[PDB]
């Protein structure tokens, strides 16, 4: 019979987070990027405003990364120079943000000094105009020193800094608050810890709209459904009026997808899996695509082609489906 469209109106929206700052705002970025503001389920235009599209940050490291050849090949000319690596991501591959991952700072790895890390950040800031995301190597002591120095040196740039965690958030939160940067809150696939962490961060006087949620996603075929459902719950909470779940969501898909055997294993060893190149591209792209359906706002990626097909997917999703 006659069809009446079922629209679920929302009580609240996910926060708007501003990335970067232009010259007149005290930064040197060419433009800012806004994410969030969703007043509906992912891409449900017919029942709420989706004002900002999800964006993609491409990964750049302060070292030649321990990645498969397939991942290195699109960058072979610039992969030893973070500045030129960043430029190629923006100018040729359509990166919205640069994700600067300072793995070189690893005390068991290259052990890049604090001065070397801030020089890398300065190098990338001078190379491109897009906003930056900066996170350390994963060593708690080393990252404290590095991210503190980075927050000081790049003050005015309105960076997104990570990662704050349940047992390790105070120092980074303070650096973000005093030197005016945004923070990534990373929780271990747990919505209760996610919620409380945002509160603990906020209680240090960092405003709610300067915080983004990293739920610790799992890669395709390796626990991705678990992070998918947590992200749907986070979005549901946001729409229902839960302030401490209204932070935009960031996802480390580049890292998680590419640690999968399926992403890079040769077809000569696994004939049934097909050619390795488009399989690996799709392995990262599918991870992003499914997570986009659960409400991802910022996707951290690596392969330029995975990036291109995801941007196209986003483009199609942003077409209004209002009735």
């Amino acid at each position: 019979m006659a069809v009446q469209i079922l629209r679920d109106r929302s009580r609240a929206a996910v926060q708007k987070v501003v990335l970067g700052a232009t010259k007149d705002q005290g930064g040197t970025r060419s433009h800012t990027i806004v994410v969030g503001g969703d007043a509906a389920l992912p891409f449900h235009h017919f029942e709420g405003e989706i004002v900002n599209r999800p964006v993609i940050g491409m990964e750049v490291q302060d070292i030649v990364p321990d990645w498969p050849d397939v991942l290195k090949d699109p960058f072979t000319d610039v992969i030893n120079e973070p500045g030129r690596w960043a430029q190629k991501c923006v100018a040729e591959y359509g990166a919205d943000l640069i994700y600067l991952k300072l793995d070189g700072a690893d005390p068991e790895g290259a052990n890049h000094s604090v001065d070397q890390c801030v020089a890398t950040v300065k190098e990338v800031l001078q190379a491109v105009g897009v906003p930056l995301v900066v996170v350390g190597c994963g060593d708690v002591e080393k990252d404290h020193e590095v991210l503190e120095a980075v927050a000081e040196a790049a003050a005015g740039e309105n960076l997104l800094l990570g990662n704050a965690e349940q047992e390790n958030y105070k120092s980074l939160t303070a650096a973000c608050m005093v030197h005016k940067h945004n923070i990534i809150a990373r929780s271990p696939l747990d919505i209760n810890i996610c919620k409380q962490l945002n509160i603990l961060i906020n209680e240090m006087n960092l405003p709610l709209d300067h915080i983004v949620i990293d739920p610790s996603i799992g890669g395709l075929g390796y626990g991705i459904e678990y992070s998918f459902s947590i992200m749907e719950r986070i979005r549901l909470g946001a729409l229902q009026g839960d302030k401490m779940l209204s932070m935009p969501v960031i996802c480390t898909v580049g890292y998680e997808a590419w640690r999968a055997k399926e992403a890079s294993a040769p077809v000569s060893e696994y004939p049934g899996w097909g050619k390795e190149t488009e399989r690996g591209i799709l392995w990262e792209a599918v991870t992003a695509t499914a997570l986009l359906q659960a409400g991802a706002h910022i996707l951290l990626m690596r392969h330029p082609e995975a990036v291109a097909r995801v941007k196209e997917n986003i483009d199609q999703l942003m077409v209004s489906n209002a009735y």
Binding site: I191, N192, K195, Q196, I199, R233, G237, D242, K243, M244
Partner: protein, 262 residues
Amino acid sequence: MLIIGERINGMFGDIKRAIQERDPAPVQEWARRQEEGGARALDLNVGPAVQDKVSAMEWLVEVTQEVSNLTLCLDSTNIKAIEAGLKKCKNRAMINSTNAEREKVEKLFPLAVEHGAALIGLTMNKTGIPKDSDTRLAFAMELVAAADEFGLPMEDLYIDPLILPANVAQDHAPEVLKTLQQIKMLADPAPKTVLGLSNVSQNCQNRPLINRTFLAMAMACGLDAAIADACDEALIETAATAEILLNQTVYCDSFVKMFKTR
């Protein structure tokens, strides 16, 4: 749990004076105190003393929404004062109240759909307050049916089963609880429910203890809103905790504060 602040009521001393001499300060200060406590709606009752209910209700609505964007719960038996109040409401409002008398139904249900306002429905007619939960339930079916009839969204109907003081009407309390939990049979989505909470402890010893205990009990039976003392901290904590134990809000260690600052 929507806490609707009870304090701006003409039956109170400091409020009765303010309306007589148009003093905005007592009204506006209570509006702020109740919101700080955790209320997300304000009950506005003209009082028994005032004569021109219309001119009083309008003033109450006018001085309140100046200092507060909370939902205004317009509370008066004078229907003409109700619509006169809705005409001044910048923000969303609710009507308090209507009973199951057909005379009142067609006088307020369209008036609720008109301004786009929630409607509180008491489970009684002119006979009085029913005791048995089945009779309370019967009036609730009528309220529910009169919502679909006039086109009021089911989640805009707030069924009030009328709680009475625990001393002289102790046997009503479990009837109210039974009525709340059987309301799940009246419709899907089930309609919302509200109580005049403080009424349960009128003329009793340790009213705060009685109020909050009954709040938790009623919420376990599906209560959605409560006209109550939003400046009672122990009551607010109970509201917060019961939400958690019903899985209506994601748990966190700071669950109390998050309800307060919601």
